[PDB]
């Protein structure tokens, strides 16, 4: 076929923050399609990959991945909170990210 996507696209909006203090240990993710926490509850615990590229090849690939998971919903509009092994670099505010359908409960 022409489509091979087995994930949902999302955007890394920002960190968890107050008006003047952020918290890089928790990121905010806008999953496209969802607009309410009731629908966002489907995505809790799902794996998240931020996939980026580098000039130096490390172990066969110039593509590096930062892994994480969805933890909870944020707000009333379907934004979710996410955690990663290493936190996201904060230059990816607005960058795309992949929310995989596993670990599945369907």
């Amino acid at each position: 076929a022409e489509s091979h996507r087995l994930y949902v696209k999302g955007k890394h909006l920002s960190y968890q923050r107050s008006k003047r203090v952020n918290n890089p240990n928790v990121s905010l993710i806008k999953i496209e399609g969802v607009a309410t926490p009731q629908d966002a509850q489907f995505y809790l615990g799902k794996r998240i990959a931020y996939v980026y590229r580098a000039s130096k090849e490390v172990r066969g690939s110039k593509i590096r991945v930062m892994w994480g998971k969805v933890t909870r919903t944020h707000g009333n509009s379907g934004v979710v909170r996410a955690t990663f092994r290493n936190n996201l670099p904060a230059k990816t505010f607005g960058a795309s990210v992949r929310i995989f359908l596993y670990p599945s409960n369907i």
Partner: protein
Amino acid sequence: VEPVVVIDGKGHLVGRLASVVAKQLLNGQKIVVVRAEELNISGEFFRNKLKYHDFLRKATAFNKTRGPFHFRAPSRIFYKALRGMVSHKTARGKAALERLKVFEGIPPPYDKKKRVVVPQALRVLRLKPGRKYTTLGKLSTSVGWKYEDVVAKLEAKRKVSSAEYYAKKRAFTKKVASANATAAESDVAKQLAALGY
């Protein structure tokens, strides 16, 4: 969901459109805004003209060249209203503002593209019927914009070409409607209708 979103700024409210586009750019959606001469501001024309005159009176006293620049074009007025809502003094704000192009009229890259609207910033959906409003192109040419008539001529030419396109598109889609109307009522058509298509 789209790579570039083309917003027809006609009949839109300036601040609400700006607060939509600012958040969209900061989220990373590339947005081009066309027809910025047809934007609307709530409030009567003399009132908004007085507002712009009070903004225009402000300048750096010892050197007017380094003061707040008072741009006159409607696209630059919208850009000022939007830069007020983006934290433009950072790298993130600059990178967001590079995802934005504003134009008066519709330039030839985008006149063949699909233009969308923002329903939560439209004047007919937001203003109470009876409230007075003003047009951004009229305010700009009252306060010093020089190119309001050439964009009117260019938009008339563009509208002629676009109507000549829409005639053919309407003919082809009525042909398609006749075609699938005759090709309805079959086994596959009834099966698709049962399955919801």
